[PDB]
Design a protein around this ligand. Sequence first.
Ligand SMILES: [Mg+2]
Lengths: 264, 49
Amino acid sequence: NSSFSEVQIARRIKEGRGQGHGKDYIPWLTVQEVPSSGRSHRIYSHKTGRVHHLLSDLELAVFLSLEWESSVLDIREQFPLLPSDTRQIAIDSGIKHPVIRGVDQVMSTDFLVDCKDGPFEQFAIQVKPAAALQDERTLEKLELERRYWQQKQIPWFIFTDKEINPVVKENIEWLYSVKTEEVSAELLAQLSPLAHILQEKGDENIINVCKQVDIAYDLELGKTLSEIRALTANGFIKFNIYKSFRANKCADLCISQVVNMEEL
Amino acid sequence: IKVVKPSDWDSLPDTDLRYIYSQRQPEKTMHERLKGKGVIVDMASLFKQ
Ligand SMILES: [Mg+2]
């Protein structure tokens, strides 16, 4: 479940969850804490070099949108809010602090983002289904969170399904319509050769190239696209999500050079 | 010091989400209200155009 006991909390604090930056960051919540009412996603990020933990399709949409922005430097998901601070805020605001079976819970903000330049050098985001904004308890918890970041002087915003760009939405539908395929060492080994092909065919349409690649190497119909699709869904390949994937040119795809730490 | 019940949310500060909810236009959603105030924003607004 998503609720923690006093020992579970203390234990997570010990392993330093919520601490670190970039590749050293460890999220407070993991896909193991995904609510039974949703779907989780584990996705690789070129910006952080980490495999992130997203607990809903909505969080996935926000993550992909953030990873697309050139100015984003770090993305820290499931960022924990200091209990002593939220404890005091609840008291001052007249709100019952989040608690499960008598155990005060550690609150978390879905994303804490750091940017290299631009309008906001740092901002926080809480993701919520729009319908949830009509729920009184949801609103109370959002107020606690709002006050927390206001206290820290860090801009905080709420993002709902209604803020997802329409093209981004259709791309996620296609990319994640079904259960994300597991990335084998064989599939991971395709990043390098695929990167070279996409590099020279930079000016050509990605779907055409995938098909021409199947014809060339006499591969099974739709083989190359299926590989690209799996690597993209897992994050090893990112593209211009604001444009239908089928409309992306090969130069729009960014392929990461990764080493399967299985050997070394 | 006492936990404010929904019926008294109309007495909270202007920027308190609970107060905003209490004074909202019932024919509209909370989403619409918060987006109008800039509490809810789309990705574009947070990055260089
Ligand atoms: Mg959330």
